[PDB]
């Protein structure tokens, strides 16, 4: 099995547009995700709130939709609760709160796209492991 361009092709937006990540982008996405997100999100779960995971289905059912590049980049800029009702930048890492989450300070737009690409591609590889927790280890 291989990491093909097809595997690396993921939704850019909600209107049926896709983008194809380079292998370098995939690697960058894994590195940046480990750097800024894995402390809470290792394996696709969420340690400080296990009710919400990073599975593609979960993200699709988020408001606004979070199962595409745009949705995820926006989330990393201005994160909301699952229903979109509250802005949670004060307690979740984002560009908007890079003052209080200093690791977001050097994340560039390119970086955010890479992280998003990681979050979308990983379950295409790992399946239920992603967001699965220890049951699937």
């Amino acid at each position: 099995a291989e990491l093909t361009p097809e595997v690396l092709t993921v939704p850019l937006n909600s209107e049926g547009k896709t983008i194809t990540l380079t292998e370098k982008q995939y690697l960058e996405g894994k590195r940046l995700f480990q750097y800024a997100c894995a402390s809470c999100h290792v394996g696709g779960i969420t340690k400080t709130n296990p009710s919400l995971d990073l599975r593609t289905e979960t993200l699709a059912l988020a408001t606004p939709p979070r199962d595409n590049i745009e949705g995820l980049v926006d989330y990393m800029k201005n994160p909301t609760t699952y229903d979109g009702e509250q802005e949670i930048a004060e307690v979740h890492p984002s560009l908007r709160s890079a003052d209080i989450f200093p690791k977001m300070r050097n994340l560039t737009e390119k970086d955010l796209v890479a992280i998003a690409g990681h979050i979308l591609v990983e379950p295409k590889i790992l399946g239920d492991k992603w967001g699965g927790g220890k049951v699937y280890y």
């Binding site: 099995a1 291989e2 093909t4 399946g127």
Partner: protein, 81 residues
């Protein structure tokens, strides 16, 4: 002592190293090439990183019959297109 030349004699002699400065690197290089040419994989039947699964398969190729086991492995191998 039991008659053979003491090791400390041998490995401090010029001749030993004239021989072994060739024989030792030669063996090391041979072992390297055994892996680097990919021969090892084929000799022992070890999957390369792209040969554990077909592209969409996620089930282990477990051998389940004793006497047709060879053919099963051949079939698993064929299934990697």
């Amino acid at each position: 002592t039991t008659g053979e030349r003491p090791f400390s004699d041998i490995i401090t002699s010029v001749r030993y190293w004239v021989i072994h400065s060739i024989t030792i690197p030669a063996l090391f290089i041979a072992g390297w090439l055994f892996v680097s040419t990919g021969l090892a994989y084929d000799v022992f039947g070890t999957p390369r990183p792209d040969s554990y699964y077909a592209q969409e398969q996620r089930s282990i190729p477990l051998v389940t019959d004793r006497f047709e086991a060879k053919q099963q492995v051949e079939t698993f191998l064929e299934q990697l297109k």
